[PDB]
């Protein structure tokens, strides 16, 4: 760092309000904003031809497949399938696709009744990690909130070293400002609102 | 002789650095020493009046360049001559807020760290820390 | 062209000997042991370097959620002095060494070599060559 | 099907390469 | 690394000076693994002591397991970058 | 890295071209495979593409010279190896500078031949 | 009396890529955090 | 009877109170002073933050208020300002660059950005022609993040300027800022792309010169004054009063600003 500075450097802890609720709510406004433009228009409304609940459909499927259990016979994967097996596969595939679209991410059955292409296994693996990652992050940020630490991730840095190797204060100053401001803000977004 | 000639050309803008780096107070100190201003001023006296005026004007501008753009925008709004006092007051106000926020002993340690990071003299840091404490009460 | 077991292993060994920078003792000996025991028989010669890079730097067992070993992982650089004291054919380290090698070989054949054998696009061919060059120059 | 639905120096080469080959097809026609 | 330094010393004692390490020598290695937090190394030393020495101290084994669980709870059981999935053309070979 | 990869590929292709030149001297130029009848072509364009007109020879040879920048050279040869310029005539690369020169000379050849056809079609 | 020094030659500021702690938050923001590191390096090289 | 519209954008209450006192004491009550958030004419905006409804952000070096250090300098710094949405909504300068990465369609945003740049370019070339300079200096931040907004800015600004017949020289943010503060006489007209760093540079230049009032050209068509400090705001008010048709009052405010920057209200 060439040239003794004209002033010292101090923490840029300017505004203290930035309540996580308001900042998160502002973050919720952005998330909904970008998604609507990406997706476009809400698709045209569709009227159901018949009325029935997903639970009722699942129960009916279970009843239908339960009476043929004795007749149903297993076979090798490469061998030709039976009528019962085909019906079960189709029904379960549709049911679990509907469930995954809805939000009931039960991976144990989705990987069985929906995976038929290695691409599908890839998608399931990617999805499975994503859900676990979000859960840990939410718990970590909840534990971080329990520990009262800045939500924004902290870069592992020793700023006394930064000024040393650097030739001027300006790039270092700004770098401190950005990370410091990042630490102050929390990167959480409203959950229920987005799912609506 | 060569050093003064190079410095005069650099300040005048005739010759830039090897990498075209900005001619800041930092870089000039980097290549021409801590007291480049004093030696340049003495050297300028051996030059006609027009060159002397240019040297003085360039030196003053370089000193103003010693601040960051954000600091100049925030503090130099009401002229450059009043920039130093406004910046010092703003710097002092930040110290008061920190003291009221996280005690004094931590502030004393922080001031020591910042003075170390700022290449500031122990006397200036002690003068600064005393002033902020007095301002508090 | 009759390719017996010695010929296959010899060809793989020659490919492994291609190096640019010195290799850490653990990485070199482990790779040699895998080739010696025939774990690279199914691996094509041109893909040996890529196989070695994944074995040393990456870890497919951890990647595709199929890890069963307790201590013998290639990211544990402190095992070098345990391999140098007991040998990779010890009762202590032999059991876990085989497991990770088998898992790494199975995953590599299942995922990477299969895709590499199904590349025909000229752009993909060029991309594959660049990957091989990088692997050859780095382990 | 979805891919069909969706759709500067290097552009000049592509323009010339396309246009260069455009006449090569035309000459063959007539 | 303390563990590497100690293991090298044992190799000198065993393979060059032809002196067999005793139980105490292996117990200074296990202590370091527990103290350092290298639970995976502790597993191997535990088997080493049982195979060669008259078992392993119970306290060190339990302490080693405790370290492993805390990493498991904290998600530190393995290096993070290893779990990241990558494809044929996404592995950034360096 | 790109420069090194392109250079090695050219060398490898040239070496293969020499080996193929031995076999075209055995079974004529059809009996090799499809791949080794695309290698020969792109490696009969590389050889033609390595020649450059020097500005010093403008007075004697008449043709204007070319100074090919390194960036152009890597891209020009890299594209040829992949097979992007598999439709350009071979002679368009002879004594030309840069990929753009190859294209402009192709225009001048395609348009030149256009008059020839209208002449040979007529008369 | 030979050449002494090129006063018009400054050392290039050697940039350092910021390294983030390896946590789940880093994995989630791996793309987000990498962009910040690239921006920081670009700022260091150019100056601001 | 007449009205002066005060806009506040990130300005401390002290500056706003000082501006209100200055106008009330100088005007004498003939012209009322109303506060709002957007205007097209007879408007003074206080604070570093850019108001809503401004597309050009020109600033010059007035002869009267030249600091002794910067005596004789003559350079015009014009910052292009894209349309400003609500604070919660994503700004165009950021949307134009992130939507492309996200794959979202960016047709309307590009069209809006193109219109803003064309207007800013037209203002810049007009100033360059009036001053007589032949080449202008474009300023674009070279950060990898702003790899799309700047590209469009350069593509459009150079197109319009070249169509007008003048030359353009593209440069970054650090080099131009240092040159403008150290050797500003080598730059005649400098256009700035819409970035936060450029806004800070414009403020720094407006302050280092000795404190000046920036001119904002709005969509509705007109000029509104802008200040950020006591002296700059006082000059902005003086210019605004001059526009309303008050010469003696404007001169008194200008004289007071020159003498006592921080306490003009008491000085006059």
TrEMBL record, chain B:
This is Uncharacterized protein. It comes from Trypanosoma brucei brucei (strain 927/4 GUTat10.1). GO terms for cellular component: kinetoplast; mitochondrion.
TrEMBL record, chain D:
It comes from the Eukaryota. This is Uncharacterized protein. It comes from Trypanosoma brucei brucei (strain 927/4 GUTat10.1). The lineage of its organism: Eukaryota, Discoba, Euglenozoa, Kinetoplastea, Metakinetoplastina. The gene is Tb05.26K5.220. The chain holds residues 319 to 354 of 370 of the full protein.
Automatic annotation (TrEMBL), chain G:
It comes from the Eukaryota. This is Uncharacterized protein. It comes from Trypanosoma brucei brucei (strain 927/4 GUTat10.1). The chain holds residues 208 to 255 of 255 of the full protein. It is found in: Membrane. Belongs to the ATPase delta chain family.
From TrEMBL, chain H:
It comes from the Eukaryota. This is Uncharacterized protein. It comes from Trypanosoma brucei equiperdum.
